[PDB]
């Protein structure tokens, strides 16, 4: 009756509280969820500090299944949604549940229909990684978006650098983030096509990280991948010297931080790369 109409107004109201939150502040570092069992009368569940916005826990308990069900009504063709409605419901669903695959697929259909800007999904997905750095679907969707932007140009090289920064942060929020590194590798293979210029800059930029983040077998695999690619791209750069420098860099870390087995196995693989050129 009226209750089903009241919640329709309430949900429509709170999604604009987030929309106007991004408008008052484009720069939003992260997304959080503040604990609040019951609602306050004259208070909106959307709380915004200088660069972070949070949502009271009561809001998600009541309104999340409403937005969730409304998207399913669109997919079953029982209740159509507008352009702005679709980009609002998916945005809210993925800001709370990034692994909602169907919600991502909706934005895909909008992106290449000229409905949604692909750059927004890069910004949207970037926010989701600040809360869920492991979320597979967020990475999976991002790869799809990146394939739509390129299909190296200046914009292409700018794009890759952006992906490198979000692969560095996602690797910092959790050690050995497989999905965050496997995505970084995917970028080099498809968006860079193993361009030797980028590969060299990646080796130089991951030196400091490798020093700090020992016992990170995922991060060191990226190191091994850079070297293996540079070898494959040459069938200018002193290729044996890179293996000379790597085995020495590995030793200096062992001397400094002994007992780390992943670090030891890394150097063991560099040895294999040296015997391969023989």
């Amino acid at each position: 009756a009226e209750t089903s109409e009241e919640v329709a107004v309430l949900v429509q109201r709170v999604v604009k509280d987030i929309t106007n939150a991004f408008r008052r502040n484009p720069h939003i570092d992260e997304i959080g969820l503040i604990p609040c069992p019951e609602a306050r009368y004259n208070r909106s569940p959307i709380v915004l500090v200088e660069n972070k916005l949070g949502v009271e826990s009561w809001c998600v308990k009541f309104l999340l299944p409403y937005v969730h069900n409304k998207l399913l009504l669109y997919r079953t063709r029982k209740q159509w949604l507008n352009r702005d409605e679709l980009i609002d419901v998916t945005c809210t669903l993925l800001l709370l549940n990034p692994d909602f695959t169907t919600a991502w697929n909706v934005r895909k259909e909008l992106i290449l229909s000229g409905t949604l800007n692909p750059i927004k999904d890069l910004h949207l997905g970037k926010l989701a990684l600040t809360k869920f750095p492991k979320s597979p679907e967020t990475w999976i969707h991002r790869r799809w978006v990146l394939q739509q932007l390129i299909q190296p140009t200046e914009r292409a090289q700018r794009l890759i650098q952006e992906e490198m920064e979000v692969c560095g942060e996602a690797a910092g929020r959790y050690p050995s983030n497989y999905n965050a590194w496997s995505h970084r590798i995917w970028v080099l293979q498809h968006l860079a096509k193993l361009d030797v210029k980028i590969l060299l800059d990646e080796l130089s930029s991951t030196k400091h990280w490798a020093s700090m983040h020992v016992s990170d077998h995922s991060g060191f695999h990226y190191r091994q991948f850079l070297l293996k690619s540079l070898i494959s791209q040459t069938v200018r750069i002193n290729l044996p010297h890179l293996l000379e420098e790597e085995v020495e860099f590995s030793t200096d870390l062992i001397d400094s931080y002994p007992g780390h087995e992943t670090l030891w196995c890394h150097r063991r693989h560099i040895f294999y790369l040296q015997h391969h050129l023989n």
């Binding site: 998600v60 308990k61 009541f62 999340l64 299944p65 969730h68 998207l71 399913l72 009504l73 997919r75 079953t76 709370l96 549940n97 692994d99 909602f100 695959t101 169907t102 697929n105 895909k108 999976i140 790869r143 799809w144 497989y178 590194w181 496997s182 590798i185 995917w186 293979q189 077998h217 995922s218 695999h221 991948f225 293996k228 693989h269 294999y272």
Partner: protein, 298 residues
């Protein structure tokens, strides 16, 4: 204690769907097809499959198959290869795969293979070896494995074999237990287990340690598929698994003293069945199903 009583475990699974958390299972609705298969496969392992509502599940699965043949994780969701596998696995337990359109599922899976032999998750073309396994497993249970180019499929998976002896999602990616479980299972169905170094990979799995029962099951199941399972201590692990139990509610968590879920509860029950448990049905490491189900008459 050291008690291996499963009566209170079966009660936990059956009474887990009675808890009024209208919001909680609303966020996990993108997994509920697999989530159902999970809870179902251990009730079958404990001989308590009859405590789960079969009729309401059969209707749910039929309502999840789309016109393209694919199957969603839930009604209204987009069809994916992952939850196409789960649905098929369920229907296999109930001796009723003819509930859904068998041909369209085959057609759907077949049309997800690329020219390099790889498989995509959905029509949006995400490449992973998990989908290679999901494809071959689904077709195996359907008896239509030759409906795809097996040669190129095997070729792509072998190309994901890293120097560690392990496997990754895509060629060049890091070796991971989850990917190994898929690829080993892939080679197991395609009768290409000789292609992998049983000794080298076995040494990798036993050495590697960290949802952690994902990781735990993926190691245990793979070693069983490999044939080099004995390289790990059975008894020491069994008691450790019994510690992950919940004496009050039931089920298994990832670590002793954590929240228990139907998912980790499986490989708690399923893991023990690999270790050599008598009170639990012999579980298959590849399909994660009771071995009894994998044998039909007609």
């Amino acid at each position: 204690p050291d008690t291996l009583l499963l009566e209170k475990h079966a009660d936990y699974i059956a009474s887990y769907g009675s808890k009024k958390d209208d919001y909680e299972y609303c966020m996990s609705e993108y997994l509920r097809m697999s989530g159902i298969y999970w809870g179902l496969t251990v009730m079958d392992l404990m001989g308590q499959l009859h405590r789960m509502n079969r009729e309401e599940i059969l209707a749910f699965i039929k309502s999840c198959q789309h016109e393209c043949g694919g199957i969603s994780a839930s009604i209204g969701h987009d069809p994916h290869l992952l939850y196409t596998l789960s649905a098929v696995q369920i229907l296999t337990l109930y001796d009723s795969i003819n509930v859904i359109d068998v041909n369209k599922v085959v057609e759907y899976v077949k049309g997800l293979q690329k020219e390099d032999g790889s498989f995509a998750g959905d029509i949006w073309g995400e490449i992973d070896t998990r989908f290679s396994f999901c494809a071959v497993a689904t077709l195996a249970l359907l008896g239509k494995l030759d409906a795809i180019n097996v040669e190129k499929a095997i070729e792509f998976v072998l190309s994901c074999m890293n120097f560690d002896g392990g496997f990754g999602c895509r060629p060049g990616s890091e070796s991971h237990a989850g990917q190994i479980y898929c690829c080993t299972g892939f080679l197991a169905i395609t009768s290409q287990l000789h292609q992998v170094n049983s000794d080298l990979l076995g040494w990798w799995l036993c050495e590697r340690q960290l949802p952690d029962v994902c990781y735990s099951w993926w190691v245990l199941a793979s070693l069983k598929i490999i044939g080099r399972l004995h390289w790990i201590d059975r008894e020491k692990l069994r008691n450790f698994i019994l510690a992950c139990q919940d004496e009050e509610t039931g089920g298994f968590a990832d670590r002793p003293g954590d929240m228990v879920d139907p998912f980790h509860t499986l490989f708690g029950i399923a893991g023990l069945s690999l270790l050599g448990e008598e009170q639990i049905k012999p579980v298959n490491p590849v399909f994660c199903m009771p071995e009894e189900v994998l044998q039909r008459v007609n």
